[PDB]
Amino acid sequence: YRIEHDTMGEVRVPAKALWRAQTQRAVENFPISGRGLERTQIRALGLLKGACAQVNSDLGLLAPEKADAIIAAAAEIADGQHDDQFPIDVFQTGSGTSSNMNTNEVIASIAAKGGVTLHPNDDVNMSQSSNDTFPTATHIAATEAAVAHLIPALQQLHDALAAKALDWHTVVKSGRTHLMDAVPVTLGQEFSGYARQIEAGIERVRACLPRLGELAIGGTAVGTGLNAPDDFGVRVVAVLVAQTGLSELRTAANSFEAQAARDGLVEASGALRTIAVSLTKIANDIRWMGSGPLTGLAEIQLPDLKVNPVLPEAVTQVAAQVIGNDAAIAWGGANGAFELNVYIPMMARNILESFKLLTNVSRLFAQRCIAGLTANVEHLRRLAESSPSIVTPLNSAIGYEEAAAVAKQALKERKTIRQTVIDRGLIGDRLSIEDLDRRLDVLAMAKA
Amino acid sequence: YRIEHDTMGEVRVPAKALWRAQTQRAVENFPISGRGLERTQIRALGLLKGACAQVNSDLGLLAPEKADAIIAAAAEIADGQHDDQFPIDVFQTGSGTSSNMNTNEVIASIAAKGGVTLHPNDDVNMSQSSNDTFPTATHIAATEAAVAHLIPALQQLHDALAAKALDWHTVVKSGRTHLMDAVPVTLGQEFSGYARQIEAGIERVRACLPRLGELAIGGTAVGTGLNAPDDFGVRVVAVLVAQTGLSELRTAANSFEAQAARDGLVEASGALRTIAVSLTKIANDIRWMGSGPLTGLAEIQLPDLGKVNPVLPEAVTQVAAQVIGNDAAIAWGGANGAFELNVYIPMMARNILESFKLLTNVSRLFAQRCIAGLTANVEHLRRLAESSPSIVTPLNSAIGYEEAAAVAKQALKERKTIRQTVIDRGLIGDRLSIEDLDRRLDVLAMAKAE
Amino acid sequence: YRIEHDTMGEVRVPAKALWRAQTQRAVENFPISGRGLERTQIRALGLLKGACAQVNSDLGLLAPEKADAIIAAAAEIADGQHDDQFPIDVFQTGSGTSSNMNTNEVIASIAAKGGVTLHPNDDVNMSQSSNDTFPTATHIAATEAAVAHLIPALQQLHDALAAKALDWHTVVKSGRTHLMDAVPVTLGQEFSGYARQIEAGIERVRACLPRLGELAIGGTAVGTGLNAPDDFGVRVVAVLVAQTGLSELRTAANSFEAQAARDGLVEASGALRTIAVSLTKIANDIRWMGSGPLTGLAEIQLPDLQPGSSIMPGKVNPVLPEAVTQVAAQVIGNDAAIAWGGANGAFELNVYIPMMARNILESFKLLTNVSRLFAQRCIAGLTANVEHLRRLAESSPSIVTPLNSAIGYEEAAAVAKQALKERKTIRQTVIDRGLIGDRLSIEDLDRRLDVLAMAKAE
Amino acid sequence: YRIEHDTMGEVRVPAKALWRAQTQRAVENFPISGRGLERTQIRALGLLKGACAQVNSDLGLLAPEKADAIIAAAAEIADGQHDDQFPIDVFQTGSGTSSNMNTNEVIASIAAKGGVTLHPNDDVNMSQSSNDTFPTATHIAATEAAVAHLIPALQQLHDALAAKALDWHTVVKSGRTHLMDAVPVTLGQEFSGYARQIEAGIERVRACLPRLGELAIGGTAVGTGLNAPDDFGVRVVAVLVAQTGLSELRTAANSFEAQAARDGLVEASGALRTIAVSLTKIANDIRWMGSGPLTGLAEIQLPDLPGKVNPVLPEAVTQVAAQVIGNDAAIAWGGANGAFELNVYIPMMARNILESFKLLTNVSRLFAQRCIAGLTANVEHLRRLAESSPSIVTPLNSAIGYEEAAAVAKQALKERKTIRQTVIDRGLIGDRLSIEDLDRRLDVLAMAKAE
Ligand SMILES: COc1ccc(S(=O)(=O)Nc2ccccc2)cc1NC(=O)Cc1n[nH]c(=O)c2ccccc12
Ligand SMILES: COc1ccc(S(=O)(=O)Nc2ccccc2)cc1NC(=O)Cc1n[nH]c(=O)c2ccccc12
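# KZ8 complex -> structure
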């Protein structure tokens, strides 16, 4: 319970806390959700402060002693060593200034322990404002989440689906359109469709990266770069690209757009929301396929964790959450004013969560559900042999006219094509039973 | 780092964990969000397990010794003492069966420490299913949140807005329509409008309670009540009402509707979404009125936490955006039940209970640390009202609409009152006395306050 | 074509048009959607202008010959005779002032055809403003759509579901939880669930009416009532209630709230959104129960409404559940547009009214129409596959539980294993393991495996 | 009325109408919205039927005389002569079967007048299904709306915003963060931000075209191509690309994904929703800049439809944005709820995405031409406020100290004077700094970092 002195009086602070007065005031002002920044957001604030210190030292604006202490303190934060020194609520000042100052004060305290004295604002916040720092750390975290985590998780899910598409290439079954019996398909063809949806998901995430990776750093309070070196932005980005290996990080095309709006987060959420839509279709088909056994479709067996489809349920619930988060993101994105969008902490929480939920559930779905699915091959064939048939494959044998007559009589008397051919006395020199059965073969009808 | 034996192998459980093998499997199956049940949900699960034990004892189905240990353990859970014993992800099996089992296991381990042996399923889950318990806890938590926390928080914000509306009864200013100057209003009138929005919010929450407080308990696996006593639902609800004082808790009107759907959460979220919409309008007007101190509207000053950033309005508008997002996720889950069970309950419960908590906490902060301390630029607001082209219309009948337009244009260009412009243009005479001018340009009378 | 003169020049207007210069400007300014007001909004603007003329006449402000001509013209509009005289886009000035002036101009042109001169603004707009009128007409139209059309349509669907619940009271089947086999229910119990969802939907509409029915009329430009009589609102409301029988219409509790916000439309849309969520569950379950007929669940048969496919000549599709689910999607989209408009008012006026009004009134219309069609052309004609349903329930592992106290849970689980393996009934499997004798008669078995008693029907 | 028939039996039809039995059943089955297919959707169905008949002719599967009658009738449909012959509700069977059959029956009725007998299903629907035609028509209409209409409308809005950015390059004013006064910017810089948002919008639409332009045609009932030639898809797409000039049209990457899902409509709606979000920011800022003329910001004047104009075009833009956000939620809901071989939400998803394209196209051109192009800046006023703001005293701190900087800012606001004239009036010239140093430190245009 130490006490610190702030322009407006006394501030008691826990003794093991590396944060100082400004952070403690923010803890007292925003008791709203009881949840603070995630590890990914803390890491990104650490990376940004170390890179800013590096560029300020390289330009001779910051004494190398101070730069070295900030860089060492920043590397600790970026490595997860201080994820308990960020107690400010998500629902804070809309610039994220409070979390920016939290990072400054924690760095000042880490450096004081190694014998170096830093001013949180004058030293740790040199060449930065309260308004270009938090959106930069947000876009670093979002870009890392897309590139290093989500894309590889979706590729894992793609690869599991594609492996089933190949394994089940000739597992014939009935098609269903409008939930009603349709012509044959293979379980492989269905899984090739699921695989494409996740591949298109990766294409969607890749397509947003040119704008998701844009950083505001260098634009300072209003986007003009006042009180920062002219090249601060390009220099800081180059340090971040070198340290993270994230080639997608880049200076904003327009320094005003990069602070007045967070449109890059709205765009990216759209890709995540499309993936949630894709995953809902895949998960719903899979739990329906596994339904029953007696009262359902009983086409496949899901691995057990009468098995409940618990991972399709976790996938569909994650999809619901990404759709809600996406609505919250767009609402904050639309409501900027003049030189600043002041919904950054809320937008950051929601997009980083959507990235995390999709990454974690996709790897789980891939490994613990898709990879272990077993097909009820004999049951599926019996469903295919109960699908409607067509007369087209008899044309070359009985002619367009007779085929048309078979098709009409089958519909009138509610008989199969096969039985109708037999009942009309059509077996003979122009069509053996062998030919009939080859022409109407359900696997051939699936065109696999 | 202690070890337990499962039907499906072995599992290492932390030494100080009161959960057992089923919870630890759920921890291993669902590493998705890293976020578990909130305090309100955990409290509701404790309340429900206590009341179920009370009823099983009352009906002679459960030994009093075992009922007493469950009731004592469930009370500790309801009192918030075991919030770290629920590690299962929100994104679990859609019935919330995993969190149900988590409660049964924690109660058995609390009881063991006091010398009593409880089977988690056979004793703590007696008469209950994996499917009627979690939604009952959700509706308990949501009803308690609405009645005990959100309604009083909204009443505090209403009363703060109403107190400003009375203090500012005669604080005349320019109306604004389409953002353009318009005939006069008072700050008091505008704040009476904000107050009504918040009073209507309370009416909206009160109106959803007949369906939000419906509990599924007693419907067991599919709604039929198979393997429960016929009157289990009405008995457990009566214990819950006797213990909590929450008279809004009631057995569901239709036991199949209460498990096949969560329409009551969708309904309640719509009320919270309407409150978010209202708060967005109030917070946006307040940060605009405080804008400046030179190039903005500079109507009022917000208290610091007139160059103060509007941080509480920013907190309010961010919360409202979250409530809007949460509302979309709840409706999506709501729509997608199948046959006898809606399997989106954990996700729905997280979103509804968060929306209640954020709105409760931000409403009290907004009332106390923003509204209560606003200060109006009274003389400034009146001088702008008295200098507005919008107020020349009552001059038409004395000087004609052509000269009234000329007065408006000169007052604006010269930055003078309409009064001083009429005098300066030599219009005082038989067609218009100084007294008649002051009657026609009485901006407070134009506002028609009481 | 026929020329006119605005203050900003000369405007050409179609010959057959009762609108004038201001409406023709608004036609040229907002070529955005190609869609104008719906007949329900036009009707309400006519009801409102007639009530206003009647009150202005009663208070001695408007000459009786002018009041009578506005009243007669406004009755023609409210009766649907002039639905083609409102060409202005939905996406107009956010107060709806363009559509208000369209109404004033069309009433003046009707009065002129009978030899009476009305000034669109000073006569037809007397005691009104460009800001209290369009929201009043919107709330009249939404209240009418709720009370006269949606609630009776939902009652018709409730009554159809409830009749099925009663007809199928003894139609036993397996429950499904997580899409997996569960203990028995009846088709009647499931339909009683659907009925309750629609009855609750009616309760939700009724609960929003105290605020949906609030009218801004009398508040004029900013909510102060400047340039209107002090009691204009209570007088216009009294006439509207007497004429329409819509008892839910009332003057707003707070005149500022009623113009600064449209919270009553956001509230009502939430009720419509909840009905869309209920209808999605009901329609989804019904198409699943009708699925197949050979590769799906085949629990019920839906009445045939049209051919499904030319490739597959005899295939018939659940077209009404598809129409219901698509309507529900549109209602959830419209709901999001309404909340967005509702949040973004400023100071004395919300300027999203035309867009909010389009979305709320369309949600009312789609839910009313699709509910009636779903009740009459789908629910009413459903048939149950009773013998199929009972066969699965009598073969369910889930029904062995009541054998426990006779043969013990380990032997019950073996009966389940075997039944499910040998495709037998539980009853037959119990016989085929010789368990009938001392601790279990054949009558005692038939009593424990009574699947309808397991469903516990009232 | 006259009598017709289908597989289900006999139906009365308006004696006059060019549709037949299946269309009339659908008119009776679906009186829900009272709105039918839009011009763009009818056009797409006619283009597709003509292309299918051309390929069927080229593969010798359909007699030349029949293919010609279809191609001629389909040209009349695509050119917009027969729109009153499409009476079927949007809210129809979720495959759009009903509107497919409507196109087939109308084509057959047209060819009959010309004395040619076509079977709606056997000839006009040859090598086709319900399930592959309506989504193909939908993706043609959406691709055409993106490439030929929305991108050029956004480019016109970009150019108008960029022209303002250049004209207003030195129009210095107060920055605003949190709605509070901040260090200087120029109107030109703010408008360069708005231009970037719209340029980024065009980039978002272009990025979605590789999947928006994927066509289902050739997959028939379930995705397998049963009952069509193996290359029906590649041949029909080549005819569509040659007839429209839309090179973005392409065969589906996966024939099952292209019918089981409409994920390309969801993706495209995400781009449109983001544009709605950008236009909301741009329009809100412009109507605030024009607020007044006495009690608001009074930074600019919007053109009339001088100082007292209502911001009617910003109101239309923000109302259109609200509708695109609503439409977007409906499209995603439909997108998620496919089952097995078919998504049956196509007519509703098509209504919403094509409406969003249309609203954004039309409101963007109006905004550009009738609001942006005619804005006038209060140039001298904006500079005087910027020169009078407590925000610009900071560069004096090093000369006069924090305490005196604060006393200068306070007096400047109270006396409504410039910072320059408050520093002089306080007698601070001489000791602390010269007039040269004061004019260097308080140059508001240099502070905005503009030339
Ligand atoms: C946020 O609006 C203001 C903020 C501060 C001040 S002040 O106290 O500092 N005084 C002042 C006077 C002249 C120049 C600068 C400042 C005045 C204003 N408004 C105005 O000057 C309003 C105004 N009046 N008359 C005009 O013909 C006019 C023309 C264009 C734009 C606005 C107007
Ligand atoms: C929309 O803001 C304005 C609109 C019009 C005008 S004007 O051109 O018509 N001039 C004028 C001057 C005084 C009163 C009325 C008019 C000035 C203003 N702003 C201000 O007066 C800003 C301002 N400056 N200094 C203060 O100490 C102060 C105190 C409280 C609030 C604001 C301020």
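# post-check
Strands of chain B lie at 2-6, 9-13, 172-177, 180-186, 214-215, 250-251, 300-301, 375-376.
Chain B has three domains: 2-128, 129-390, 391-446.
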